[PDB]
Design a protein around this ligand. Structure first.
Ligand SMILES: NC(=O)c1ncn([C@@H]2O[C@H](COP(=O)(O)OP(=O)(O)OP(=O)(O)O)[C@@H](O)[C@H]2O)n1
Ligand SMILES: [Mg+2]
Length: 476
RNA sequence: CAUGGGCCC
RNA sequence: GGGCCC
């Protein structure tokens, strides 16, 4: 998105952390090319000659405007994927009850309790237990006063820039490539779930290549659904965007909002409203009130759905803008916002799309960048989706998500203070799929020190998840 | 003891 | 309440 150009303000929004993340006993064994991000332009490690606050805003290279015939081409594609979308999800997209928006239907996790509240509830000391009864699902004064307000469209706000205390490859750290999180006022996040909460539920619970979304899925059982499907095709590309989130041009955004969330598909007129408030934003990083047109607010409600709908309409628009007769069945695709796998028989050309894609402000590039350009052949066992490769499992003939040891090792070098035992239980079931030998190497560090799930119990868990009746087949 | 949105104990 | 992927 284009910055008008940031201002001064007298109020000053603290963030600049020091990492809650810390080395582990694994840390010294694995010596990973991975550290906590920078949470301070003062932080030593950091290359010298680096103002951390520069880069955070170097993802705003402008805001591609779109010809009038591209806006029509894009409109069609969005109404088309929208036709598909509501064909599979139905048209029951009535507003959600403040009770659900807080509580959550069957497929919409509740809103989280102890979570930051956005503005200005932190310019005025208050957490989200002070305007909502999380586990009674209950508004209070201003939430309900603003509920009333956005109902009128006479509501307006600002986004609280943050920094992702997270691990990152060492180099990205030194570039000061910290990931931003733009936190929305919690009232907003709530109205949004009312406006489009039943949509997102249905999305979550019909994920699959049919709707091109993997949001809602379980990389751990769903990998089988997905692997067999994608191995039915002669060509499978692993595409990488870049700044995906921030380069959603203003026109692309306003069109999909208009095309996906109309009232003719069951929504309430104000679902376009809450959504379009997301185009031109005000990001308050500290005393800098940075004002931006374009992009998405990474972490603005439904952020992953939106970005997924958008990726889907982009591909189809890039194919539609290069050849004729391209329908949704021309290909197949699954994304999770940024991430995307695509497949096709038609021997399609993806280095011929880069430009058509650059007409929306987006820069695709191959995943295997140590070639040069998009090639044919690649099956679904050369790609990555969500940081997991597709491998088939010896013992079962089933597909399974596998992360590079170097990643797994990264995750296992750093924990928040006294989380190490819990984290490990969690990472145990990721590392299952790396086999018995590596699972073991990967955990030597913590022996006689922490509890380590047996490789065997994690396997039979998995086997029962992927298709329980094969659990029951390792029997008769 | 970051936002979203998912899912895992 | 924790971990991950996005
Ligand atoms: N926590 C959040 O609010 C959140 N997390 C993931 N997302 C959606 O998923 C995308 C992940 O962006 P990345 O960190 O991969 O970077 P990028 O902007 O896509 O590209 P690159 O790393 O190539 O510069 C984002 O761009 C965003 O659309 N939002
Ligand atoms: Mg990828």
């Amino acid at each position: 998105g284009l910055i008008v150009d940031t201002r001064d303000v007298e109020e000053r929004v603290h963030v600049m952390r020091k990492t809650k993340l810390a080395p582990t006993v694994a840390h010294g064994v694995f010596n990973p090319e991975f550290g906590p991000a920078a949470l301070s332009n003062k932080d030593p490690r950091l290359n010298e000659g680096v103002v951390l606050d520069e880069v955070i805003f170097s993802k705003h290279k402008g805001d591609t405007k779109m010809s009038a015939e591209d806006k029509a081409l894009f409109r069609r594609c969005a109404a088309d994927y929208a036709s598909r979308l509501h064909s599979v999800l139905g048209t029951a997209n009535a507003p959600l009850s403040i009770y659900e928006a807080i509580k959550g239907v069957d497929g919409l996790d509740a809103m989280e309790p102890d979570t930051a509240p956005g503005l200005p509830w932190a310019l005025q000391g208050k957490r989200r237990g002070a305007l909502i009864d999380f586990e009674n699902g209950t508004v209070g004064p201003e939430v309900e006063a603003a509920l009333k307000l956005m109902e009128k469209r006479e509501y307006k706000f600002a986004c609280q820039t943050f920094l992702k205390d997270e691990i990152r490859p060492m180099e990205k750290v030194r570039a000061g490539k910290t990931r931003i999180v733009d936190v929305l006022p919690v009232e907003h996040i709530l109205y949004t779930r009312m406006m489009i909460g039943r949509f997102c539920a249905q999305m979550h619970s019909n994920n699959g290549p049919q709707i091109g979304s993997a949001v809602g899925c379980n990389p751990d059982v769903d990998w089988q659904r997905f692997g067999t499907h994608f191995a039915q095709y002669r060509n499978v590309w692993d595409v990488d965007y870049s700044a995906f989130d921030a380069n959603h041009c203003s026109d692309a955004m306003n069109i999909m909002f208009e095309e996906v969330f109309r009232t003719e598909f069951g929504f309430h007129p104000n679902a376009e409203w809450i959504l379009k408030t997301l185009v031109n934003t005000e990001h308050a990083y500290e005393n800098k009130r940075i004002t931006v047109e374009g992009g998405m607010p990474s972490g603005c409600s439904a952020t992953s759905i939106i970005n997924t709908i958008l990726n889907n309409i982009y591909v189809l628009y890039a194919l539609r803008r290069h050849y004729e007769g391209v329908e949704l069945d021309t290909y197949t695709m699954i994304s999770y916002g940024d991430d995307i796998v695509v497949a096709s028989d038609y021997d399609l050309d993806f280095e011929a799309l880069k430009p058509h894609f650059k007409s929306l402000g987006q820069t695709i590039t191959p995943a295997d960048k140590s070639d040069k350009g998009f090639v044919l052949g690649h099956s679904i066992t050369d790609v990555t989706f969500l940081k997991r490769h597709f491998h088939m499992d010896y013992g079962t003939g089933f597909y399974k998500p596998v992360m590079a040891s170097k990643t797994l090792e990264a995750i296992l070098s750093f924990a928040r203070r006294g989380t190490i035992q819990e984290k490990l239980i969690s990472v145990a079931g990721l590392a299952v799929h790396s086999g018995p030998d590596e699972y073991r190497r990967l955990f030597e560090p913590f022996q006689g020190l922490f509890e380590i799930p047996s490789y065997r119990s994690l396997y039979l868990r998995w086997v029962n998840a992927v298709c329980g009746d094969a659990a029951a087949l390792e029997h008769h």
